[PDB]
């Protein structure tokens, strides 16, 4: 005896025991860092993962496992809001394990699942961070959930294309290894692999998107769930001799000629292997071609193989009916990356700014932009009438940022996927968390929808309102019925009223907040016209 | 009658009297201000009219420069009514003066009109024109002459003795300073002088304001929907000269094409019949068009110094006050001379594609991309297809273009300078409007209230309408004396503010009274004065 039958699996590699957890509707059953991969160390540092070779003995799933090797934020040090994000266990190279949350006891029912992807710009995050705990939404909506972790920074995505030894997207490759898994053992669980929803937010939804658009990744999942992030977009991919040049550098920046050499590849990649995992994370960032914020230096690189062209063309061209996406933003996405090194900008006070320091805060938000380009930038987001209103200007340029990084291709990729025949529905996150830390001028800035879609606010401890809770039930109601029947609206009900899908006729979204949905025609339209339609045709020819 | 007969340093004159509403007005018409600048003399700078002994007849309206007479609606009175009332005749130059009668108490503020047009078309002759309300009613003595249009008013071949250009402009100046000399024989003050236009006419008025020796013949002006600066007001020297060779070039000039002086290629058009010109006149453009008309003053390093964005850019404006405004909806009348789609009978609801086409059509010298510009500013993007908005949209695209956001921008410069500056839009269309609703309150449709002419009573306007009239000719008056358009002691008004580079406050005239607004445009305004320029040029 002794052994609880709910906690203990079998799966394909061997077997697991798990942990119980008290969530506070009721008790779920736990199961963490299983590994889904050989650990990608030494000689596999670069490398496409390899499958987790099978162990005997049974396997401790009860606690979560390393994060994978990441810069640490040290912007506003010992500040929730900064440090919400940073690693909760210990870095390590071997850091490829999942988690998966499902009801106690297991489920008779082959329930459906929900993986999900992780964020952090492809620098960073883990799944073992708080905000993503998914035990509430194993409880109340008895869902079986899913998190992998992936390799993020140089590990992940450091690229010399068309090599054999760095080859790139390697991470992007975690993730699907991570999906394949999801496959081949969630039924083990109580899971349903005859439906899968991805859902993912900023880098993650990134990846979400990506793996929309590459087609053996489209082979394990049925939905998919992109918040705040979009494959197509300025910062979630890179040029291949871009991703090159960037990698040469750094790999010349860690003393890895060695000595002004540098012409092999495999020579090249051999040596930046033996460098501390560190001195890596040291200079990811050096290698950047700008002054520049939103943009990350190393991420999924366009390499004709996984994303076999660039994502602009490939949901432009998509054949899409296979398929169901819900898709939104936060009601704020710029100010959270301003305070990142737009000047003017701080958490600490109201950041009011010059019109000098607008404008160049538009050259370092919009940084491949050219004068004109940028003169475009400012002429469209300037108020003529009170063209040096402080709180405007402010205003202005975390709309700036927000508008070019998130909202409008957001609304590309609804536009096409929509045109391309699939179900999407769309929102706009609205309300401001109770709890929330950052300053008031900031709004509901970028990632803070998060906790409310795991239903954090379900925990008393965590000082939420009950509005707030009763919201974030709404919420996770949504998203399991979106997972569950491919439509976020209640089934049985009619009511409230109901959730209509996006179409590229009519363009219609709902606001998430604390009142029921109302429905909004066309997201940031006009703005999104010049964006996504006027700005290419300038810089481009500029 | 002894108002009737007046001397005027040219010699005797003999007016008429007239019925005005609320009183009689000393009217004389035809008085010629410059020999004839017929034969060698077209193209040519007016010299001024030799005296003449004998009672000169001022009873009527002498004739209509020649010029291309609107085929467009036939019998239309909207199109019809800005064609010529009186005969085509190179020998136009006269002007017009109204007193009231009697002659005046002491000398009285003077109202100056230039017409507008398009520098192919106009009168003082005109109905809308008619200047006895003014006259009897404010009080006011009020000038309003011919000057040239067309290939003998503009067509330069600049640096030519024989062809200098602007020679319309100095037929407006050269009425000017008649009227410094011998103004005040009709009882008007020589140092009271309002000069006011509308659409060219604005232009011209602009124009004086930007050219040196003129700068002493006035002191106040108003600008109706025109400017001196913008898209169609002025061609550069080569341009000038490019279409007066090609127009030449159409009728026989120079013969079988030798080639060589200008002297002799425009002493070869000066013996084409003017009927030849006005026919050929339209060929010369550059491309198919809305605004943009064949010849017009002419950048010659002589009447402006440098071109009218340089002049109001620079220039020092201490001491001027200027009352500048436009319409409601300018573009629409012009949509219906050539963007497909557009009629005065069917209410215009238009494709996407014919929205598309028109605007190349009217911003003409756009490139691709500007075009790309236009379009994507002026789409509602929610509504792409919408015929109702791609219409009104293209009636904003030519009007924004060509009049509202130049006004907005000699405004603005008139005021960084030390101007005195009112500005204001009128939102109300007459009653008596033979247009279709679909173009609101058209170009040029204020010029009937300003001059007083609902206060007739068998024209049948509405009797709010007339008390409107009073209203702005009060407010022109007021202006033409004070250099304001407010009442001494009134208040009310509410109060017509200064337009300031900062508060931007403008006016709306209405039936309803007086409303202030702030940034006429502004957005949509950054964009055509501030950055489509950066984009046609890289383009
Ligand atoms: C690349 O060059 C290295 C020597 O630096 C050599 O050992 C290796 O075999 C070479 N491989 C290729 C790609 O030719
Ligand atoms: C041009 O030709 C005519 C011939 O009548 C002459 O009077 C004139 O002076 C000539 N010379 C030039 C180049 O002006
Ligand atoms: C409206 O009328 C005009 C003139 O008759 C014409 O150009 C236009 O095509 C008409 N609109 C349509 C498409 O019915
Ligand atoms: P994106 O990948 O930019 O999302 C981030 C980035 C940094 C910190 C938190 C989050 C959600
Ligand atoms: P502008 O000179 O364009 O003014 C016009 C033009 C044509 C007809 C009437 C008017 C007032």
Redo the contacts with the bound molecule.
Sequence with gaps: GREDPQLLVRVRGGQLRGIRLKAPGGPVSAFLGIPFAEPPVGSRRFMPPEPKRPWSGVLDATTFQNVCYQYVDTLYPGFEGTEM?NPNRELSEDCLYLNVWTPYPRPASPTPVLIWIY????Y??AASLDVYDGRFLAQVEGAVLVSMNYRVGTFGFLALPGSREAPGNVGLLDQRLALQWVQENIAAFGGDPMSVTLFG????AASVGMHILSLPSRSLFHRAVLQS?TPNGPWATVSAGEARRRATLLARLVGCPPGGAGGNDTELIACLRTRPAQDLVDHEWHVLPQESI?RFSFVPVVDGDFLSDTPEALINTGDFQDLQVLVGVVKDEGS?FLVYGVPGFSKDNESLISRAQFLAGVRIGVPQASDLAAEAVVLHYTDWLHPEDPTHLRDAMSAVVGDHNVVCPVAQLAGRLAAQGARVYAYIFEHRASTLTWPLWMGVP??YE?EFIFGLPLDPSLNYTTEERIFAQRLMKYWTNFARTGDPNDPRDSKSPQWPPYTTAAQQYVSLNLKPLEVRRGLRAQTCAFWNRFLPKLLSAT
């Design positions: 994000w964020g952090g710009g492809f960073s995050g937010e900023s880098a993650g992030g939103f959270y970028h990632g998060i």
